[PDB]
Each structure stands twice: as structure tokens, then as C-alpha cells.
């Protein structure tokens, strides 16, 4: 097998700017590398083949260069719809292999998350479970750390996070951390904290509640 390594994995940029990303093969693939655009709710589009050839119907802002071992893709002038996922595929030998991908993100203004913490719903309590939910909302960039503290102690087990992709209206991320305890463990403590450390603030954004309040 030939190994593709695409760099960078991630990349932020804005409409109008140029970007160019990389794909490196573990051996020589002559000139034979293709590029695919992947977008939610649409089938994978071929953009370039054989290193530099435009696929029929693809705008001339997409361009490709390379031979043997090192290739690039270049988008001349980013268009809103160009923010997407790009993969490279080598077409020089059996077995066909791909790179891992590059995700092309729309850059916007740094944005501090709006934090919210939620105690277990009583309906949950009654059935023996206790989940504390914490929503971290509308922030940029994507990098964030969230930390659960029980009565002052950081607790890692039973925490499930999920992030949204970049918002279609304002380009921001949002998160939800849910620590899940047994109702018996839940009542054994009093203070529940959710702490979010984010590029926008030197000190963490803390939210918590006391079980009797």
C-alpha cells in the first residue's frame, strides 16, 4: 500500500483568501492524485485528477500541482460554499488509497462561550439516574476544555461530550457535557460545578449549583 498523509488536518480562512493544502505519498505515484470535496447532504464531488487536471464543471479557482511524491491543492479565492472537507486519492496503483482529509473552516471573531448548568430532572431522579448537563454555547475557536468538579474535586468518569459543527448562521461552535451519576452517588454530594476554559478568557467560566438550593 501507498500511504497518504494530508496536512493540515484543519484550516481556518475567510471568503476571498487563498488556501493551499498538502498531500504526501509514501512512494512515487507518478502524477496520479485526485481531490474530492465532501459536504454534508451532497455526494462527494471530484475536483482535480492526475495532479493538475480540472474536472469538467469545476470552477477555475480550484487548481492542483505536484508529481512523484508531493502534491497540493489550491483554492484561489475562497467562496462560501468552498468551506468543506477535502480528500486526496492516489490513482497510480492497486490498491487505491486516500489521505485522511483536511477540514476547511470559516474563520470568525473570537467568541466566549455562554455557559449553562442543569441539575437532574426529577423524572430522572425517580428512576435511579442523575445526569447533570452543561451547555457551552456559541464560541469560537473550537478549542475548549470543560471540567466537572464535585464538591471541589475534579471528576472525569461518566462525562459525555458532544460538539456541534460550525453554525450555519454565525459560524460558532457549541458543546454539551453531561456527567452521569447514580442517584445514590448524586445525593452523597452537594456542590456540582462545570468549568470551561477557553481562549477568550485567562480565567475559567464557572457554573455550579448546590443540591439543596
Amino acid at each position: 500500500d501507498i500511504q497518504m498523509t494530508q496536512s493540515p488536518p484543519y484550516l481556518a480562512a475567510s471568503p476571498g483568501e487563498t488556501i493551499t493544502i498538502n498531500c504526501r505519498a509514501s512512494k512515487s505515484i507518478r502524477k496520479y492524485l485526485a481531490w474530492y470535496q465532501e459536504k454534508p447532504g451532497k455526494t462527494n464531488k471530484l475536483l482535480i485528477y492526475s495532479g493538475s487536471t480540472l474536472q469538467f464543471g469545476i470552477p477555475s479557482r480550484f487548481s492542483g500541482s505536484g508529481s512523484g511524491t508531493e502534491f497540493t491543492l489550491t483554492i484561489s479565492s475562497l467562496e462560501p460554499e468552498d468551506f468543506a472537507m477535502y480528500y486526496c486519492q492516489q490513482h497510480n496503483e492497486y490498491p487505491l488509497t486516500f489521505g485522511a482529509g483536511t477540514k476547511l473552516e470559516l474563520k470568525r471573531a473570537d467568541a466566549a462561550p455562554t455557559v449553562s448548568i442543569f441539575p437532574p430532572s426529577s423524572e430522572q431522579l425517580t428512576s435511579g439516574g442523575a445526569s447533570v448537563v452543561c451547555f457551552l454555547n456559541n464560541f469560537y475557536p473550537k478549542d475548549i476544555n470543560v471540567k466537572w468538579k464535585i464538591d471541589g474535586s475534579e471528576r472525569q468518569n461518566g462525562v459525555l461530550n458532544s460538539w456541534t459543527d460550525q453554525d450555519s448562521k454565525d459560524s460558532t461552535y457549541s458543546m454539551s457535557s453531561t456527567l452521569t451519576l447514580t442517584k445514590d452517588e448524586y445525593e452523597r454530594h452537594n456542590s456540582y460545578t462545570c468549568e470551561a476554559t477557553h481562549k477568550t478568557s485567562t480565567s475559567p467560566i464557572v457554573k455550579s449549583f448546590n443540591r439543596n438550593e
Binding site: 480528500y87 490513482h91 496503483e93 430532572s121 430522572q124 456541534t164
Partner: protein
């Protein structure tokens, strides 16, 4: 216009088999190699194999010699892929794609047309409807200006569930998060932020639907006392 319609999602218990389709339209089916690609979340595309419907010949990635059988039915412009001895490993999206050049000797080329993908979920988990709990702010915390309300949807299988806020009439300031696996079962949440004058002065209700278990519930969000 060239299409590739792939079949719907399949669920399969481990060790089992599954067979999926790819219905090709709008070009000479027997003239182009149909390729099958696999995609597991965060792990990049792998090439499985390809079938040349014009002479029913097939080529497989060494990695799938065991796993996959490719076949075509030319009267029906369809290619089939059947995956056997299933494993969690085999839980992924599978695509068929058309080689961008016709002809038998352009085995390894690129692809100009992909199908939307078929989803294979391999699990021992049983069909479970979800518990729907409402998230209402910390006792007496209508904070400054706005207020965020939530919905927790716990322990269901299989995916998906579909959520709306106030029958779908309320729809900005909603964040619905992708489900995550806990042990055997999926769980997901959704937030909705709205001005602190809107509530608790008007009613906000969460609408979960799990088609797989024929559940439809509505939790109205109630202040905490």
C-alpha cells in the same frame, strides 16, 4: 444525468451478514468499473473493491478479501456488495462510485460520481425507546437578559431520534447535538436559548420522535421549585 442510488441503513447483530445495493442510472452501466469505498468516523476513506459489470470481473483490496463480495446485475443497472462475519469494526458508511473513465483497463482511476452512502450499524443492542427528561434552569435562575432551556434524550437505540422546539415553530437559538454512545445506547441533548421575558411566561415544549420504537413525546419545560 448520472446517478447512483444506494439502499437504506442496515442494522446487524455481530457475526451476521448484510447485502447493499447501488442502482446506477444515466450512462452505460457495463462500461465503467463500480468501486466500493468504506468510511468509519474519524479514520479516512478505504477502498474495498470494484466490479466491472461488462464481464462481471472483480478486484478486491487485500484488506477485504474475506469481508466483501461484489456482484452486478446488468438488466437492473445495479451493483451489490455483501459483507459477512460482521463486527463493530464494520460499522461505517459505504459508498459505491463510478470510475471517471470507461474501459476495462483503467482499473485504478479516480471517481466522478458517488452514491450518497449506505450506513451499516453493527450492534448487539436491542430496540429501546428513549427517556425524555426536560432541562430547566437552576432553581430561580432567570439570569440577566436571556435564558437557556434544554432537553436530554437518554438511552435509545438505534439512531435516529428527531427533536423540535415548540412543534418546530421555535427554531433559532436551538442547538441540537450529535448523539453519543453510552455502553450500548445513544444519548443526545438539545439546547434552546430565548429572551428571559418569553419565559416562564410562555410555554416551551421539547418534541422528541424515535421512529424505530414508534415514540413521540412532548416535555414542556417547568420552572424548578
Amino acid at each position: 444525468e448520472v446517478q447512483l442510488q444506494q439502499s437504506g441503513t442496515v442494522l446487524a447483530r455481530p457475526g451476521a451478514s448484510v447485502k447493499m445495493s447501488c442502482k446506477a442510472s444515466g450512462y452505460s452501466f457495463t462500461s465503467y468499473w463500480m468501486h466500493w469505498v468504506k468510511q468509519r468516523p474519524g479514520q479516512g476513506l478505504e477502498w474495498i473493491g470494484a466490479v466491472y459489470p461488462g464481464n462481471s470481473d472483480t478486484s478486491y483490496n487485500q484488506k477485504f478479501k474475506g469481508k466483501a463480495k461484489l456482484t452486478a446485475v446488468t438488466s437492473a443497472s445495479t451493483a451489490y456488495m455483501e459483507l459477512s462475519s460482521l463486527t463493530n469494526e464494520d460499522s461505517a458508511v459505504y459508498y459505491c462510485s463510478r470510475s471517471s473513465l470507461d474501459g476495462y483497463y483503467v482499473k485504478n482511476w479516480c471517481f466522478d460520481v458517488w452514491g450518497q452512502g449506505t450506513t451499516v450499524t453493527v450492534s448487539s443492542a436491542k430496540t429501546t425507546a428513549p427517556s425524555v427528561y426536560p432541562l430547566a434552569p437552576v432553581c430561580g435562575d432567570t439570569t440577566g437578559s436571556s435564558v437557556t432551556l434544554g432537553c436530554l434524550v437518554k438511552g435509545y437505540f438505534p439512531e435516529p431520534v428527531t427533536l423540535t422546539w415548540n412543534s418546530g415553530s421555535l427554531s433559532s437559538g436551538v442547538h441540537t447535538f450529535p448523539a453519543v454512545l453510552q455502553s450500548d445506547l445513544y444519548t443526545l441533548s438539545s439546547s434552546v436559548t430565548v429572551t428571559s421575558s418569553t419565559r416562564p411566561s410562555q410555554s416551551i415544549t421539547c418534541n422528541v420522535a424515535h421512529p424505530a420504537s414508534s415514540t413521540k413525546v412532548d416535555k414542556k419545560i417547568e420552572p424548578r421549585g
